[PDB]
Amino acid sequence: AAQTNAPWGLARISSTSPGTSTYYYDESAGQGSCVYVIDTGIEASHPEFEGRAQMVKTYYYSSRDGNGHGTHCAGTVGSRTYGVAKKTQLFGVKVLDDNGSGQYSTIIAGMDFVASDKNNRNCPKGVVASLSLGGGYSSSVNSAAARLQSSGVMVAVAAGNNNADARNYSPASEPSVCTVGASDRYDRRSSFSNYGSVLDIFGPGTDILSTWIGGSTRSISGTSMATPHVAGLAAYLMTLGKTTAASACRYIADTANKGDLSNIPFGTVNLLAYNNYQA
Ligand SMILES: O=c1[nH]c2cc(Cl)ccc2o1
């Protein structure tokens, strides 16, 4: 399939070159996979989700997204226009308040929730979790991310937006999950993106158009925006049978565009997520 006039990040993950505007992908489109978006919630009623999104858990007075951040990330995973995996099922877990903040103890509870809740969902092709959040290093937060991964969920986490070494942030610093840095439309490391040996992959993160609350859309930037590209990519590849939750991060690194990004510090991977789709 080909989506013309796609957001640049979509076109980028199906391209060997920057500077194109069509997204190419296999029509299976993540059908039969599921992606948990652990964030501020999802506006599931947005027409862009086509009934494929739902809230499954909140730790606050509402499961509605009063911020927009979770809806934007969910849109990059799987919305019809802005999404990598356009037929995946989306499950929202609201661990962050409407100001985008959440306690680590709630975030941990949300991760253990997904590890169990996947057994209450139909995801024959596999399960992904997208975690566009983090704070300072915590071994308990990292351990929760490792349990979720161990349970058979492909965990993608944001590297963080401090222009710093991601070793000092969690869950970014957990080795067993997929830590995602941010790039821009000219194949430059995003100005804010964290870096370091713990990063596994980069995805599009600067000026990313996606869904927003109020049935709207907007373009925002962050490693929070790169992470759902990788999570949607994993769901898409698992539906194709090319990889599994346990192997998907290594597979995406194996199949990435290599050495194409600028301003990558020495010792940080120079790998850009790529679906390797041949139309
Ligand atoms: O301190 C922070 N803020 C963060 C935001 C994201 Cl998306 C990831 C890690 C973080 O660490």
PDB file of C-alpha atoms and ligand atoms in Angstrom:
ATOM      1  CA  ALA A   1       0.000   0.000   0.000  1.00  0.00           C
ATOM      2  CA  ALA A   2       0.927   3.633  -0.534  1.00  0.00           C
ATOM      3  CA  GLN A   3      -0.321   6.637   1.446  1.00  0.00           C
ATOM      4  CA  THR A   4       0.394   9.813  -0.440  1.00  0.00           C
ATOM      5  CA  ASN A   5       1.114  13.081   1.342  1.00  0.00           C
ATOM      6  CA  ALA A   6       1.914  11.241   4.541  1.00  0.00           C
ATOM      7  CA  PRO A   7       3.529  12.832   7.610  1.00  0.00           C
ATOM      8  CA  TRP A   8       7.265  12.924   7.015  1.00  0.00           C
ATOM      9  CA  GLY A   9       7.958  10.406   9.775  1.00  0.00           C
ATOM     10  CA  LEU A  10       5.735   7.807   8.178  1.00  0.00           C
ATOM     11  CA  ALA A  11       7.431   8.328   4.827  1.00  0.00           C
ATOM     12  CA  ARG A  12      10.812   8.133   6.569  1.00  0.00           C
ATOM     13  CA  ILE A  13      10.341   4.728   8.169  1.00  0.00           C
ATOM     14  CA  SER A  14       9.528   3.207   4.758  1.00  0.00           C
ATOM     15  CA  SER A  15      12.378   4.941   2.924  1.00  0.00           C
ATOM     16  CA  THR A  16      16.091   4.517   2.322  1.00  0.00           C
ATOM     17  CA  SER A  17      16.313   8.324   1.899  1.00  0.00           C
ATOM     18  CA  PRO A  18      14.973  11.417   3.654  1.00  0.00           C
ATOM     19  CA  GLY A  19      12.917  13.903   1.720  1.00  0.00           C
ATOM     20  CA  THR A  20      10.005  11.807   0.429  1.00  0.00           C
ATOM     21  CA  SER A  21       6.334  12.125   1.355  1.00  0.00           C
ATOM     22  CA  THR A  22       4.676   8.745   0.618  1.00  0.00           C
ATOM     23  CA  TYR A  23       4.381   5.968   3.210  1.00  0.00           C
ATOM     24  CA  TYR A  24       4.628   2.431   1.808  1.00  0.00           C
ATOM     25  CA  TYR A  25       3.589  -0.590   3.864  1.00  0.00           C
ATOM     26  CA  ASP A  26       2.095  -4.053   3.636  1.00  0.00           C
ATOM     27  CA  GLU A  27      -1.713  -3.908   3.716  1.00  0.00           C
ATOM     28  CA  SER A  28      -1.855  -6.258   6.733  1.00  0.00           C
ATOM     29  CA  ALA A  29      -1.105  -3.034   8.629  1.00  0.00           C
ATOM     30  CA  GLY A  30      -0.745  -4.607  12.074  1.00  0.00           C
ATOM     31  CA  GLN A  31      -4.087  -6.432  11.947  1.00  0.00           C
ATOM     32  CA  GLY A  32      -4.294  -8.898  14.822  1.00  0.00           C
ATOM     33  CA  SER A  33      -1.689  -7.116  16.942  1.00  0.00           C
ATOM     34  CA  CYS A  34      -2.360  -4.904  19.958  1.00  0.00           C
ATOM     35  CA  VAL A  35      -0.482  -1.848  21.203  1.00  0.00           C
ATOM     36  CA  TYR A  36      -0.851  -0.508  24.741  1.00  0.00           C
ATOM     37  CA  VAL A  37      -0.307   3.254  25.016  1.00  0.00           C
ATOM     38  CA  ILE A  38       0.685   3.936  28.618  1.00  0.00           C
ATOM     39  CA  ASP A  39       0.245   7.672  28.908  1.00  0.00           C
ATOM     40  CA  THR A  40      -2.375  10.398  29.543  1.00  0.00           C
ATOM     41  CA  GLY A  41      -5.112   8.280  27.914  1.00  0.00           C
ATOM     42  CA  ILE A  42      -6.552   8.198  24.405  1.00  0.00           C
ATOM     43  CA  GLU A  43      -9.486  10.069  22.900  1.00  0.00           C
ATOM     44  CA  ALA A  44     -10.885   6.825  21.503  1.00  0.00           C
ATOM     45  CA  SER A  45     -13.821   8.627  19.861  1.00  0.00           C
ATOM     46  CA  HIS A  46     -11.476  10.427  17.456  1.00  0.00           C
ATOM     47  CA  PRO A  47     -12.573   9.503  13.901  1.00  0.00           C
ATOM     48  CA  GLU A  48      -8.925   8.742  13.111  1.00  0.00           C
ATOM     49  CA  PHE A  49      -9.034   5.627  15.327  1.00  0.00           C
ATOM     50  CA  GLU A  50     -12.021   4.059  13.530  1.00  0.00           C
ATOM     51  CA  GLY A  51     -13.304   2.253  16.621  1.00  0.00           C
ATOM     52  CA  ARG A  52      -9.981   0.430  17.061  1.00  0.00           C
ATOM     53  CA  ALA A  53      -8.992   2.358  20.220  1.00  0.00           C
ATOM     54  CA  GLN A  54     -10.337   1.955  23.720  1.00  0.00           C
ATOM     55  CA  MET A  55      -9.378   2.861  27.261  1.00  0.00           C
ATOM     56  CA  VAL A  56      -8.805  -0.188  29.460  1.00  0.00           C
ATOM     57  CA  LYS A  57      -7.440   1.331  32.692  1.00  0.00           C
ATOM     58  CA  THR A  58      -7.076   4.611  34.550  1.00  0.00           C
ATOM     59  CA  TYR A  59      -5.682   5.514  37.951  1.00  0.00           C
ATOM     60  CA  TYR A  60      -7.492   8.885  38.018  1.00  0.00           C
ATOM     61  CA  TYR A  61     -11.054  10.199  38.141  1.00  0.00           C
ATOM     62  CA  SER A  62     -11.447   9.784  34.388  1.00  0.00           C
ATOM     63  CA  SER A  63      -9.961   7.653  31.651  1.00  0.00           C
ATOM     64  CA  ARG A  64     -10.375  10.529  29.191  1.00  0.00           C
ATOM     65  CA  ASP A  65      -7.262  12.207  27.809  1.00  0.00           C
ATOM     66  CA  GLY A  66      -7.436  15.771  29.162  1.00  0.00           C
ATOM     67  CA  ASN A  67      -3.945  16.581  27.908  1.00  0.00           C
ATOM     68  CA  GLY A  68      -3.545  15.328  24.304  1.00  0.00           C
ATOM     69  CA  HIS A  69      -0.128  13.716  24.658  1.00  0.00           C
ATOM     70  CA  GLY A  70      -1.473  10.165  24.883  1.00  0.00           C
ATOM     71  CA  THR A  71      -3.852  10.734  21.969  1.00  0.00           C
ATOM     72  CA  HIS A  72      -0.986  12.036  19.841  1.00  0.00           C
ATOM     73  CA  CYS A  73       1.205   9.049  20.642  1.00  0.00           C
ATOM     74  CA  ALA A  74      -1.675   6.660  20.011  1.00  0.00           C
ATOM     75  CA  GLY A  75      -2.264   8.384  16.670  1.00  0.00           C
ATOM     76  CA  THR A  76       1.334   7.741  15.637  1.00  0.00           C
ATOM     77  CA  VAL A  77       1.002   4.039  16.531  1.00  0.00           C
ATOM     78  CA  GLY A  78      -2.232   3.342  14.741  1.00  0.00           C
ATOM     79  CA  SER A  79      -4.458   6.143  13.471  1.00  0.00           C
ATOM     80  CA  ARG A  80      -5.674   5.823   9.894  1.00  0.00           C
ATOM     81  CA  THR A  81      -3.778   8.911   8.612  1.00  0.00           C
ATOM     82  CA  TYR A  82      -0.997   9.445  11.147  1.00  0.00           C
ATOM     83  CA  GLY A  83      -0.302   5.839  12.209  1.00  0.00           C
ATOM     84  CA  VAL A  84       2.397   3.308  11.351  1.00  0.00           C
ATOM     85  CA  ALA A  85       0.168   0.245  11.999  1.00  0.00           C
ATOM     86  CA  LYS A  86      -3.166   1.319  10.647  1.00  0.00           C
ATOM     87  CA  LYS A  87      -5.154  -1.795  11.612  1.00  0.00           C
ATOM     88  CA  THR A  88      -3.716  -2.519  15.057  1.00  0.00           C
ATOM     89  CA  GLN A  89      -5.892  -2.512  18.156  1.00  0.00           C
ATOM     90  CA  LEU A  90      -5.047   0.308  20.599  1.00  0.00           C
ATOM     91  CA  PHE A  91      -5.427  -0.034  24.380  1.00  0.00           C
ATOM     92  CA  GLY A  92      -5.056   3.041  26.598  1.00  0.00           C
ATOM     93  CA  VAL A  93      -3.709   2.905  30.146  1.00  0.00           C
ATOM     94  CA  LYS A  94      -3.861   6.304  31.878  1.00  0.00           C
ATOM     95  CA  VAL A  95      -0.907   6.467  34.263  1.00  0.00           C
ATOM     96  CA  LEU A  96      -0.313  10.214  33.771  1.00  0.00           C
ATOM     97  CA  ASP A  97      -2.628  13.028  34.892  1.00  0.00           C
ATOM     98  CA  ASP A  98      -3.980  15.702  32.572  1.00  0.00           C
ATOM     99  CA  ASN A  99      -0.842  17.763  33.221  1.00  0.00           C
ATOM    100  CA  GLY A 100       1.243  14.866  31.874  1.00  0.00           C
ATOM    101  CA  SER A 101       2.645  13.979  35.307  1.00  0.00           C
ATOM    102  CA  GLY A 102       2.457  10.702  37.175  1.00  0.00           C
ATOM    103  CA  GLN A 103       3.953   9.041  40.211  1.00  0.00           C
ATOM    104  CA  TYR A 104       6.431   6.223  39.608  1.00  0.00           C
ATOM    105  CA  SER A 105       4.327   3.913  41.782  1.00  0.00           C
ATOM    106  CA  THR A 106       1.359   4.455  39.436  1.00  0.00           C
ATOM    107  CA  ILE A 107       3.520   3.999  36.342  1.00  0.00           C
ATOM    108  CA  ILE A 108       4.819   0.696  37.766  1.00  0.00           C
ATOM    109  CA  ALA A 109       1.269  -0.432  38.510  1.00  0.00           C
ATOM    110  CA  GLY A 110       0.314   0.379  34.921  1.00  0.00           C
ATOM    111  CA  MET A 111       3.161  -1.692  33.514  1.00  0.00           C
ATOM    112  CA  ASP A 112       2.271  -4.716  35.658  1.00  0.00           C
ATOM    113  CA  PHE A 113      -1.352  -4.154  34.638  1.00  0.00           C
ATOM    114  CA  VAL A 114      -0.467  -4.533  30.942  1.00  0.00           C
ATOM    115  CA  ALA A 115       1.569  -7.679  31.603  1.00  0.00           C
ATOM    116  CA  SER A 116      -1.567  -9.323  32.997  1.00  0.00           C
ATOM    117  CA  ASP A 117      -4.221  -7.528  30.958  1.00  0.00           C
ATOM    118  CA  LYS A 118      -2.844  -8.805  27.662  1.00  0.00           C
ATOM    119  CA  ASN A 119      -4.269 -12.167  28.721  1.00  0.00           C
ATOM    120  CA  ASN A 120      -7.723 -10.561  28.599  1.00  0.00           C
ATOM    121  CA  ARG A 121      -7.303  -9.346  25.013  1.00  0.00           C
ATOM    122  CA  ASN A 122      -7.203 -10.938  21.564  1.00  0.00           C
ATOM    123  CA  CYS A 123      -3.796 -10.278  20.022  1.00  0.00           C
ATOM    124  CA  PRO A 124      -2.872 -13.409  18.015  1.00  0.00           C
ATOM    125  CA  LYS A 125      -0.109 -11.552  16.199  1.00  0.00           C
ATOM    126  CA  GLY A 126       1.476 -10.159  19.385  1.00  0.00           C
ATOM    127  CA  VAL A 127       1.519  -7.375  21.969  1.00  0.00           C
ATOM    128  CA  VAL A 128       3.432  -4.088  22.088  1.00  0.00           C
ATOM    129  CA  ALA A 129       3.646  -1.394  24.777  1.00  0.00           C
ATOM    130  CA  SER A 130       4.596   2.225  24.051  1.00  0.00           C
ATOM    131  CA  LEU A 131       5.925   4.251  27.027  1.00  0.00           C
ATOM    132  CA  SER A 132       6.438   7.905  26.103  1.00  0.00           C
ATOM    133  CA  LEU A 133       7.337   8.869  29.646  1.00  0.00           C
ATOM    134  CA  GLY A 134      10.126   8.802  32.192  1.00  0.00           C
ATOM    135  CA  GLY A 135      12.054  10.506  34.934  1.00  0.00           C
ATOM    136  CA  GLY A 136      15.253  10.045  36.877  1.00  0.00           C
ATOM    137  CA  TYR A 137      16.859   6.651  37.315  1.00  0.00           C
ATOM    138  CA  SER A 138      14.871   4.171  39.399  1.00  0.00           C
ATOM    139  CA  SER A 139      15.727   0.488  39.614  1.00  0.00           C
ATOM    140  CA  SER A 140      12.092  -0.266  40.483  1.00  0.00           C
ATOM    141  CA  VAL A 141      10.827   1.473  37.345  1.00  0.00           C
ATOM    142  CA  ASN A 142      13.408  -0.353  35.227  1.00  0.00           C
ATOM    143  CA  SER A 143      12.460  -3.667  36.834  1.00  0.00           C
ATOM    144  CA  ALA A 144       8.798  -3.072  35.978  1.00  0.00           C
ATOM    145  CA  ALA A 145       9.732  -2.403  32.367  1.00  0.00           C
ATOM    146  CA  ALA A 146      11.826  -5.594  32.305  1.00  0.00           C
ATOM    147  CA  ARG A 147       8.951  -7.648  33.753  1.00  0.00           C
ATOM    148  CA  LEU A 148       6.591  -6.299  31.125  1.00  0.00           C
ATOM    149  CA  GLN A 149       9.053  -7.217  28.375  1.00  0.00           C
ATOM    150  CA  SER A 150       9.720 -10.651  29.916  1.00  0.00           C
ATOM    151  CA  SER A 151       5.950 -11.327  29.968  1.00  0.00           C
ATOM    152  CA  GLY A 152       5.902 -11.299  26.143  1.00  0.00           C
ATOM    153  CA  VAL A 153       5.285  -7.636  25.347  1.00  0.00           C
ATOM    154  CA  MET A 154       7.519  -5.601  23.050  1.00  0.00           C
ATOM    155  CA  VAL A 155       8.334  -2.578  25.272  1.00  0.00           C
ATOM    156  CA  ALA A 156       9.357   0.640  23.507  1.00  0.00           C
ATOM    157  CA  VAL A 157      10.331   3.547  25.774  1.00  0.00           C
ATOM    158  CA  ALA A 158      11.310   7.141  25.127  1.00  0.00           C
ATOM    159  CA  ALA A 159      14.985   7.969  25.630  1.00  0.00           C
ATOM    160  CA  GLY A 160      14.131  11.386  27.086  1.00  0.00           C
ATOM    161  CA  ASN A 161      14.454  15.011  25.992  1.00  0.00           C
ATOM    162  CA  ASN A 162      17.383  16.347  28.028  1.00  0.00           C
ATOM    163  CA  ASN A 163      20.150  16.200  25.384  1.00  0.00           C
ATOM    164  CA  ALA A 164      21.859  13.962  27.932  1.00  0.00           C
ATOM    165  CA  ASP A 165      22.966  10.387  28.451  1.00  0.00           C
ATOM    166  CA  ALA A 166      19.844   8.257  28.845  1.00  0.00           C
ATOM    167  CA  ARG A 167      21.649   6.014  31.360  1.00  0.00           C
ATOM    168  CA  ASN A 168      20.372   8.409  34.074  1.00  0.00           C
ATOM    169  CA  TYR A 169      16.672   8.123  33.197  1.00  0.00           C
ATOM    170  CA  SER A 170      14.039   5.418  33.632  1.00  0.00           C
ATOM    171  CA  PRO A 171      12.661   3.313  32.030  1.00  0.00           C
ATOM    172  CA  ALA A 172      15.053   4.572  29.277  1.00  0.00           C
ATOM    173  CA  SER A 173      18.045   2.966  31.003  1.00  0.00           C
ATOM    174  CA  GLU A 174      16.545  -0.534  31.321  1.00  0.00           C
ATOM    175  CA  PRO A 175      18.692  -2.729  29.029  1.00  0.00           C
ATOM    176  CA  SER A 176      16.028  -5.281  28.105  1.00  0.00           C
ATOM    177  CA  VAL A 177      13.553  -2.850  26.532  1.00  0.00           C
ATOM    178  CA  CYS A 178      13.765  -0.817  23.329  1.00  0.00           C
ATOM    179  CA  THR A 179      14.977   2.724  24.084  1.00  0.00           C
ATOM    180  CA  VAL A 180      14.129   5.160  21.305  1.00  0.00           C
ATOM    181  CA  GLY A 181      15.884   8.377  20.420  1.00  0.00           C
ATOM    182  CA  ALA A 182      14.547  11.178  18.220  1.00  0.00           C
ATOM    183  CA  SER A 183      15.548  12.378  14.723  1.00  0.00           C
ATOM    184  CA  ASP A 184      14.361  15.151  12.394  1.00  0.00           C
ATOM    185  CA  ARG A 185      13.288  15.298   8.774  1.00  0.00           C
ATOM    186  CA  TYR A 186      16.848  15.999   7.599  1.00  0.00           C
ATOM    187  CA  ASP A 187      18.207  12.888   9.341  1.00  0.00           C
ATOM    188  CA  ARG A 188      19.754  14.897  12.186  1.00  0.00           C
ATOM    189  CA  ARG A 189      19.534  13.798  15.785  1.00  0.00           C
ATOM    190  CA  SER A 190      16.795  15.943  17.305  1.00  0.00           C
ATOM    191  CA  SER A 191      18.207  18.838  19.337  1.00  0.00           C
ATOM    192  CA  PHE A 192      16.611  17.592  22.566  1.00  0.00           C
ATOM    193  CA  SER A 193      17.095  13.833  22.145  1.00  0.00           C
ATOM    194  CA  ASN A 194      18.945  11.902  24.787  1.00  0.00           C
ATOM    195  CA  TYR A 195      21.747   9.628  23.595  1.00  0.00           C
ATOM    196  CA  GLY A 196      24.130   7.000  24.927  1.00  0.00           C
ATOM    197  CA  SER A 197      24.875   3.294  24.846  1.00  0.00           C
ATOM    198  CA  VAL A 198      21.430   2.390  26.226  1.00  0.00           C
ATOM    199  CA  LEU A 199      19.687   3.649  23.074  1.00  0.00           C
ATOM    200  CA  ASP A 200      18.660   0.899  20.686  1.00  0.00           C
ATOM    201  CA  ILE A 201      17.181   2.875  17.773  1.00  0.00           C
ATOM    202  CA  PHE A 202      16.090   6.297  16.553  1.00  0.00           C
ATOM    203  CA  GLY A 203      12.721   7.213  15.102  1.00  0.00           C
ATOM    204  CA  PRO A 204      11.106  10.391  13.779  1.00  0.00           C
ATOM    205  CA  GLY A 205      10.577  12.859  16.647  1.00  0.00           C
ATOM    206  CA  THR A 206      10.767  16.477  15.453  1.00  0.00           C
ATOM    207  CA  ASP A 207       7.590  18.091  14.056  1.00  0.00           C
ATOM    208  CA  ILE A 208       5.366  15.006  14.120  1.00  0.00           C
ATOM    209  CA  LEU A 209       1.756  15.489  13.008  1.00  0.00           C
ATOM    210  CA  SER A 210      -0.780  13.294  14.762  1.00  0.00           C
ATOM    211  CA  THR A 211      -4.172  13.214  16.451  1.00  0.00           C
ATOM    212  CA  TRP A 212      -5.095  15.495  19.330  1.00  0.00           C
ATOM    213  CA  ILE A 213      -8.017  15.819  21.728  1.00  0.00           C
ATOM    214  CA  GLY A 214     -11.174  17.545  20.563  1.00  0.00           C
ATOM    215  CA  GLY A 215     -11.039  15.468  17.373  1.00  0.00           C
ATOM    216  CA  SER A 216      -8.166  17.592  16.120  1.00  0.00           C
ATOM    217  CA  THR A 217      -4.564  17.253  14.976  1.00  0.00           C
ATOM    218  CA  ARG A 218      -1.266  18.986  15.693  1.00  0.00           C
ATOM    219  CA  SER A 219       2.485  18.695  15.174  1.00  0.00           C
ATOM    220  CA  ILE A 220       4.681  18.342  18.278  1.00  0.00           C
ATOM    221  CA  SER A 221       8.215  17.145  19.016  1.00  0.00           C
ATOM    222  CA  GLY A 222       9.839  14.760  21.446  1.00  0.00           C
ATOM    223  CA  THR A 223      11.256  11.331  22.027  1.00  0.00           C
ATOM    224  CA  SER A 224       7.650  10.699  23.056  1.00  0.00           C
ATOM    225  CA  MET A 225       6.827  11.036  19.351  1.00  0.00           C
ATOM    226  CA  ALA A 226       9.639   8.758  18.152  1.00  0.00           C
ATOM    227  CA  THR A 227       8.685   5.934  20.532  1.00  0.00           C
ATOM    228  CA  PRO A 228       5.239   5.226  18.995  1.00  0.00           C
ATOM    229  CA  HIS A 229       6.813   5.032  15.529  1.00  0.00           C
ATOM    230  CA  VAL A 230       8.928   2.158  16.824  1.00  0.00           C
ATOM    231  CA  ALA A 231       6.003   0.602  18.724  1.00  0.00           C
ATOM    232  CA  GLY A 232       3.786   0.755  15.658  1.00  0.00           C
ATOM    233  CA  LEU A 233       6.641  -0.614  13.557  1.00  0.00           C
ATOM    234  CA  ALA A 234       7.008  -3.564  15.927  1.00  0.00           C
ATOM    235  CA  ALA A 235       3.276  -4.335  15.743  1.00  0.00           C
ATOM    236  CA  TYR A 236       3.411  -4.154  11.939  1.00  0.00           C
ATOM    237  CA  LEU A 237       6.411  -6.517  11.746  1.00  0.00           C
ATOM    238  CA  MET A 238       4.921  -8.994  14.231  1.00  0.00           C
ATOM    239  CA  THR A 239       1.721  -9.139  12.164  1.00  0.00           C
ATOM    240  CA  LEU A 240       3.891  -9.928   9.149  1.00  0.00           C
ATOM    241  CA  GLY A 241       5.469 -12.793  11.131  1.00  0.00           C
ATOM    242  CA  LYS A 242       8.954 -11.345  10.733  1.00  0.00           C
ATOM    243  CA  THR A 243       9.675 -11.071  14.464  1.00  0.00           C
ATOM    244  CA  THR A 244       8.291 -11.585  17.971  1.00  0.00           C
ATOM    245  CA  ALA A 245       7.921  -9.416  21.051  1.00  0.00           C
ATOM    246  CA  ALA A 246      11.111 -10.866  22.539  1.00  0.00           C
ATOM    247  CA  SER A 247      13.117 -10.298  19.347  1.00  0.00           C
ATOM    248  CA  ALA A 248      11.504  -7.221  17.778  1.00  0.00           C
ATOM    249  CA  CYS A 249      13.942  -4.600  19.098  1.00  0.00           C
ATOM    250  CA  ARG A 250      16.949  -6.556  17.861  1.00  0.00           C
ATOM    251  CA  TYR A 251      15.178  -7.174  14.549  1.00  0.00           C
ATOM    252  CA  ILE A 252      14.426  -3.475  14.085  1.00  0.00           C
ATOM    253  CA  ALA A 253      18.041  -2.646  14.893  1.00  0.00           C
ATOM    254  CA  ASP A 254      19.222  -5.393  12.476  1.00  0.00           C
ATOM    255  CA  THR A 255      17.055  -4.031   9.654  1.00  0.00           C
ATOM    256  CA  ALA A 256      17.466  -0.281  10.338  1.00  0.00           C
ATOM    257  CA  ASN A 257      18.936   2.325   8.054  1.00  0.00           C
ATOM    258  CA  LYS A 258      22.529   2.486   9.313  1.00  0.00           C
ATOM    259  CA  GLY A 259      24.958   5.380   9.559  1.00  0.00           C
ATOM    260  CA  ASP A 260      22.519   7.853   8.004  1.00  0.00           C
ATOM    261  CA  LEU A 261      21.964  10.220  10.976  1.00  0.00           C
ATOM    262  CA  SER A 262      24.108  13.239  11.836  1.00  0.00           C
ATOM    263  CA  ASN A 263      25.178  14.524  15.270  1.00  0.00           C
ATOM    264  CA  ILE A 264      25.108  11.029  16.784  1.00  0.00           C
ATOM    265  CA  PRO A 265      27.646  11.010  19.656  1.00  0.00           C
ATOM    266  CA  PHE A 266      30.463   8.479  19.489  1.00  0.00           C
ATOM    267  CA  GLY A 267      29.257   5.316  21.201  1.00  0.00           C
ATOM    268  CA  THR A 268      25.542   5.825  20.438  1.00  0.00           C
ATOM    269  CA  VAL A 269      23.935   3.649  17.747  1.00  0.00           C
ATOM    270  CA  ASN A 270      23.400   5.267  14.357  1.00  0.00           C
ATOM    271  CA  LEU A 271      20.274   3.308  13.429  1.00  0.00           C
ATOM    272  CA  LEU A 272      17.001   4.697  12.083  1.00  0.00           C
ATOM    273  CA  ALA A 273      13.852   2.559  12.193  1.00  0.00           C
ATOM    274  CA  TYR A 274      12.937   1.143   8.770  1.00  0.00           C
ATOM    275  CA  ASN A 275      10.166  -1.239   7.669  1.00  0.00           C
ATOM    276  CA  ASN A 276      12.130  -2.629   4.679  1.00  0.00           C
ATOM    277  CA  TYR A 277       8.866  -2.859   2.757  1.00  0.00           C
ATOM    278  CA  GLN A 278       9.290  -3.588  -0.952  1.00  0.00           C
ATOM    279  CA  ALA A 279       6.199  -2.345  -2.780  1.00  0.00           C
TER     280      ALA A 279
HETATM  281  O1  LIG B   1      12.810  13.364  33.186  1.00  0.00           O
HETATM  282  C1  LIG B   1      12.360  12.819  32.239  1.00  0.00           C
HETATM  283  N1  LIG B   1      11.364  13.264  31.436  1.00  0.00           N
HETATM  284  C2  LIG B   1      11.159  12.329  30.480  1.00  0.00           C
HETATM  285  C3  LIG B   1      10.262  12.274  29.392  1.00  0.00           C
HETATM  286  C4  LIG B   1      10.267  11.182  28.540  1.00  0.00           C
HETATM  287 CL1  LIG B   1       9.147  11.092  27.161  1.00  0.00          CL
HETATM  288  C5  LIG B   1      11.165  10.148  28.769  1.00  0.00           C
HETATM  289  C6  LIG B   1      12.040  10.205  29.836  1.00  0.00           C
HETATM  290  C7  LIG B   1      12.022  11.310  30.699  1.00  0.00           C
HETATM  291  O2  LIG B   1      12.774  11.612  31.781  1.00  0.00           O
END
